[PDB]
Amino acid sequence: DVSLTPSGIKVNDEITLLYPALKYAEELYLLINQNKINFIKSMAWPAFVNNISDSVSFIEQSMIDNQNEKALILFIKYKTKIAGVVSFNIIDHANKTAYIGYWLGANFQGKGIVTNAINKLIQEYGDSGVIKRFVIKCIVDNKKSNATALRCGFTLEGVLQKAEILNGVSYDQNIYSKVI
Numbered sequence: 001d002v003s004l005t006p007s008g009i010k011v012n013d014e015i016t017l018l019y020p021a022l023k024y025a026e027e028l029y030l031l032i033n034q035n036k037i038n039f040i041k042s043m044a045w046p047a048f049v050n051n052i053s054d055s056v057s058f059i060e061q062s063m064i065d066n067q068n069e070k071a072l073i074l075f076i077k078y079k080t081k082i083a084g085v086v087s088f089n090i091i092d093h094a095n096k097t098a099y100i101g102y103w104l105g106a107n108f109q110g111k112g113i114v115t116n117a118i119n120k121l122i123q124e125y126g127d128s129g130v131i132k133r134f135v136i137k138c139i140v141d142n143k144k145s146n147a148t149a150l151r152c153g154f155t156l157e158g159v160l161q162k163a164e165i166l167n168g169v170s171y172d173q174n175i176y177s178k179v180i
């Protein structure tokens with residue numbers, strides 16, 4: 001499979017899902033910084049990304065988790081730029097289940113980048129039999145994520161009551177799945 005390269009997973013002619021590396025720290029930090037105000041609306045961690053060293057720490061931990069298959073953290077490269085992150089936040093090996101996370105900078109939204117990335121990951125891990133069940137969990141009112149999940153052929157399984165906390169407030173999540 002020539003799409004599985006040493007540096008990452010080639011989705012199409014424009015998108016590569018890069019294995020994390022320290023060289024990416026600067027660009028990743030700057031991207032997060034540019035999007036901090038909007039990102040804080042849907043994710044908890046951006047509020048605390050205050051310097052490049054925070055992105056270095058994230059990369060270091062991500063490489064450890066990737067090595068040990070605890071997670072699969074990938075940096076989305078669109079053309080020449082890092083566009084965001086797509087991940088298996090958690091890999092449950094015993095139950096062959098992967099929990100998916102993602103984000104894109106504002107300048108990279110509306111381009112199908114995450115839909116294309118997810119479809120590629122599900123082909124690679126799902127059609128190979130490594131993962132049986134893929135899961136997306138996001139806050140109910142996350143309109144754009146819901147659209148992405150449905151676009152990728154996920155099914156809504158239910159609402160997880162008061163399951164995600166942002167800034168001290170618990171919010172309901174939709175749980176979507178795609179089963180091979």
Ligand SMILES: CC(C)(COP(=O)(O)OP(=O)(O)OC[C@H]1O[C@@H](n2cnc3c(N)ncnc32)[C@H](O)[C@@H]1OP(=O)(O)O)[C@@H](O)C(=O)NCCC(=O)NCCS
Binds near residue numbers: 110114137142144
């Ligand atoms: C969730 C998020 C990644 C969605 O980004 P997105 O760009 O809408 O994601 P997709 O890859 O599914 O792209 C779909 C959009 O691209 C457009 N489109 C353009 N080219 C396309 C292509 N090749 N394939 C599919 N759609 C394409 C679609 O029309 C759609 O645009 P629309 O929203 O104007 O209808 C983004 O809103 C985000 O980063 N949010 C903050 C982080 C977050 O909430 N994460 C999830 C928390 S659990």
Ligand SMILES: Nc1ncnc2c1ncn2[C@@H]1O[C@H](COS(=O)(=O)NC(=O)[C@@H](N)CCC(=O)O)[C@@H](O)[C@H]1O
Binds near residue numbers: 042043101136
């Ligand atoms: N410090 C950091 N720098 C750069 N990216 C970071 C980051 N911390 C998390 N990410 C990436 O953000 C994406 C979304 O992950 S996330 O915010 O934790 N939320 C979720 O994945 C949702 N499933 C909500 C959590 C839940 O299920 O309860 C995931 O792609 C995740 O890898």
